[PDB]
Symmetry: C2
Subunit: 297 residues, 2 copies
């Protein structure tokens, strides 16, 4: 659902007549054509309209989400793979590949291409997508990342997908760079938070499992810098888990303390998790505990 339409919906739903736009110096005519599709609209005018309709800033940026050929093809593709419709998903990747190779370069297009290849490869038992294609494209995107000095949340999406695909080693130092860049601002979008939270939890888990103590400490320090709201109880808990690990690695606490902690957790997660998720979480804790025990040899 397009922006013009959405604004018309708020405007009629809030009984604001067209005259008000004109009183605020936004031509109603140009506006009518904005909702209609016969004209564009400057962002300054949109700002005036959102104050008129008492729309919130996030409420506004949320609608700015474009709808290109790429965006459309990618939502069709996602709905195809998630509904297990693999004929559609295959045909959409082939079409999109042709469009991608003939049209103009865009990073958003590149990341969508990679994403289609990756998901087709991971979920379609009869995909024709090859590991070679995936790796060629992967290496283009990784090289852009290496040479970049600014990162955004879609770069982090790309790294989580690359790690799930598992065709090449995961670039660790690069993950640090991406996290640092993305986290220089306060993250306000719950979908980005979901991605970041999952990446850091997995990152901490993989680090413990490696038993590389300088690396574990590095990950731990990133984790202690990562800010979580007081109402984000799950991340509050992972911060406490990371802190307990830090205290055992540095001989500030002993395994008895860890066990007391772990038992408390295991009794609490009944309230928040389905029992499947519960068993997984416990499994993670046992693996952490084992790696820790082995580190303290």
């Amino acid at each position: 659902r397009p922006l013009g339409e959405e604004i018309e919906r708020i405007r009629k739903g809030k009984n604001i007549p067209l005259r008000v736009f004109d009183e605020n110096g936004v031509s109603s005519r140009s506006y009518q054509r904005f909702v209609q599709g016969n004209s564009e609209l400057r962002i300054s005018d949109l700002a005036i309209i959102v104050e008129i309709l008492s729309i919130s800033p996030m409420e506004m940026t949320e609608k700015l989400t474009p709808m290109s050929k790429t965006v459309l093809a990618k939502e069709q593709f996602n709905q195809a793979i998630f509904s297990k419709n693999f004929q559609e998903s295959s045909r959409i990747v082939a079409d999109y590949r042709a469009y991608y190779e003939k049209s103009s370069f865009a990073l958003g297009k590149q990341e969508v291409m990679y994403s289609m290849l990756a998901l087709e490869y991971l979920f379609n038992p009869q995909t024709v997508v090859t590991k070679e294609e995936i790796i060629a494209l992967e290496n283009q995107i990784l090289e852009r990342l290496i040479n970049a000095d600014v990162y955004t949340i879609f770069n982090l999406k790309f790294l989580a997908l690359q790690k799930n695909v598992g065709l090449q080693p995961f670039p660790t130092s690069l993950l640090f760079r991406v996290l640092q860049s993305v986290n220089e601002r306060e993250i306000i979008d719950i979908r980005s938070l979901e991605i970041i939270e999952q990446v850091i939890i997995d990152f901490l888990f993989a680090a413990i499992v490696s038993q590389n103590v300088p690396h574990i400490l590095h990950v731990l320090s990133m984790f202690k810098e990562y800010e979580v709201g007081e109402n984000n109880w799950r991340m509050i808990l992972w911060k406490k888990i990371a802190e307990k690990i830090e205290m055992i690695l540095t001989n500030e606490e002993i395994f008895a303390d860890w066990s007391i902690f772990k038992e408390q957790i295991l009794l609490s997660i009944t309230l928040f998790l389905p029992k499947a998720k519960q068993e997984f979480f416990a499994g993670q804790l046992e693996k952490i505990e084992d790696s820790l025990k082995e580190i303290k040899e």
Copy 2:
């Protein structure tokens, strides 16, 4: 017409564009005039929405990453932040002067719901926190009823309508319009909320709503609120709201006699053993307080 200052947007887009090594020719290849764009960042031109949409695809930017830059602050937003830090630093001389200037700008200006809602918020906070305010009850109530009348006749609601209602209940100068809250909640939740600040507003409002309802021992109203809560969609990872939904369900099961009081007690003790992992000890004691008041109301209703 009123000025909007977008050099921050120009700056942020330029920072991302150079940080990602994308040359201007790429903007032209994708149908954004590079010269129009340069004139934008320089400040001599206004950015088209069609062009911004193309640019975020080029730089692989999620628009929400840029929210702080996509929304400059007009006189109104700026004045409200000035007022806010005035009252919070308990410096009431400034707050008095700020509301005084904003009232004048408000009466001279073009009609805007956003302006109306900031005026109300200034009157309300001035009433609540500044002991020597010249703001009157009469003034607040009149503006309150204009806003309410608009809400009553609206068919669409946004998160600021919920903010307004929460503030209205703090002011307490008129009874709280309970029916209206049900309508606003129902409307706001038909779309998915993506922003943590709206989620914080919504979550606080419905937790307060459920708590007030339980404490009142008005069982039809509690059942109405319980039903609303049961429909409220929560993510897997939002452990806090998972718990409040379970609290609401335990109360629902007990009021409809599918379960008894023993089960509540079992539940409450498990919770009390858990909150140490998630909460500072202040927050712990307060949450425990709430849980005890809920138990009191349940026990009293059920005998």
